[PDB]
C-alpha cells in the first residue's frame with residue numbers, strides 16, 4: 001500500500017529534502033507541505049511489526065544517519081539504499097508514531113507542533129503530540145490507510 | 150495469516166466454548182489452555198484497522214452478544230455468522246489488546262490475570278494487564294505474527 005507520512009500536529013508530510021525521484025544516499029528527510037509522487041512511501045514488512053520505510057520513487061529506505069542500532073537523540077533521519085536491521089521501524093497506527101528498532105521515535109527536529117517547511121526529522125526518545133504521525137491515502141490526505149500487508 | 154489469540158497474562162487462548170469445528174450462533178468465547186485447529190483465527194480487514202475476527206474452522210466471526218454498536222460492560226463475546234458493523238474490531242498489536250468498534254475491549258470476565266479454563270470473555274471499557282492479548286503462530290505460541298494483510 002502506498003501512503004503519505006503525515007505529521008499529525010501540522011499536516012505536513014515526510015519528504016526527501018529537495019524532493020528528488022532519486023535522492024542520493026544520506027539525503028535528509030524533512031517535513032514539507034507539498035504533495036507529489038516523490039513523497040510517497042511504502043512499508044516492507046520484515047518481521048511482524050518491523051520493516052523498512054521505502055521511498056517509492058527511488059527504492060531507498062529510511063535510516064538513522066550512520067546506521068546505529070541505538071541512535072542517540074537528535075540523530076538525523078536520511079534515505080539510504082542499504083537494507084539491514086538498523087533500518088527497521090514499526091508503523092504504530094494505534095498510538096500514531098513511528099518507532100525505530102532501538103525504541104526511539106521519528107520527530108521533527110526541535111519538537112514543534114508546527115514545524116516550517118524543510119524542518120529536518122530526527123530520532124528522539126520523547127513521546128508527545130508533536131511526534132505523532134498518521135499514514136494516509138495519496139488520493140485523500142485525511143483518509144488513514146493500512147500500511148501493513 | 151492464521152493465528153492464536155493468546156491472553157498475555159495467563160497464556161490461555163481464545164476458544165469457542167466446547168471447541169466445535171462448527172459452533173452454533175451465539176456460542177460463547179472462552180479462555181482455554183488447549184491448542185487445536187478449532188481455536189485458530191484469522192482477521193479479515195474491512196476498513197484500515199477495523200475488521201472481522203474469524204473462527205477459521207467455521208467461518209463465523211466474533212460479536213458482542215446482541216450485536217449492539219455500544220455494548221455495555223459485561224456483554225458476552227460470542228461467535229455468529231452475521232457480518233455487520235457491530236462485529237468490527239481492531240487488533241492492537243502495539244498496546245496488545247482487542248478493541249470493539251464502540252471503544253471497549255475484550256476481557257476475561259471478572260478481570261483475573263490467571264483465570265481458569267472455560268472463563269467467559271466479555272466487553273469492558275477498562276485497560277489493564279489482564280485484558281492484554283497477543284497474536285501468535287499456531288506452530289509457536291511464543292512467536293508473534295502479523296494479523297493484518
Ligand SMILES: OC[C@H]1O[C@@H](O)[C@H](O)[C@@H](O)[C@H]1O
Nearest residue numbers: 256257258259260271273275
Ligand atoms: O468482566 C471484566 C471486568 O472485570 C472486573 O472485575 C474488572 O475490574 C474490570 O476491569 C474488567 O476486567
Ligand SMILES: OC[C@H]1O[C@H](O)[C@H](O)[C@@H](O)[C@H]1O
Nearest residue numbers: 015016017018019030032034
Ligand atoms: O525539501 C522538500 C521539497 O523539495 C523541493 O523544494 C520540492 O519542490 C518540494 O515539493 C519538496 O519536495
Ligand SMILES: OC[C@H]1O[C@H](O)[C@H](O)[C@@H](O)[C@H]1O
Nearest residue numbers: 063064065066067078080082
Ligand atoms: O546513514 C545510513 C548509513 O549509515 C552507514 O553508512 C551504514 O553503513 C549504511 O548501511 C547506512 O545505514
Ligand SMILES: OC[C@H]1O[C@H](O)[C@H](O)[C@@H](O)[C@H]1O
Nearest residue numbers: 107108109110111122124126
Ligand atoms: O528534536 C526533537 C526534540 O525537540 C525538543 O528538544 C523537544 O523538547 C523534544 O521532546 C524532542 O521533540
Ligand SMILES: OC[C@H]1O[C@H](O)[C@H](O)[C@@H](O)[C@H]1O
Nearest residue numbers: 164165166167168179181183
Ligand atoms: O471450551 C473450550 C474447550 O472445549 C472442549 O473442552 C475442548 O476439548 C477443549 O480443547 C477446548 O476447546
Ligand SMILES: OC[C@H]1O[C@H](O)[C@H](O)[C@@H](O)[C@H]1O
Nearest residue numbers: 212213214215216227229231
Ligand atoms: O449475538 C450476536 C448477534 O446479536 C444479535 O442477535 C444481532 O442482531 C446479530 O447480528 C448478532 O450480532
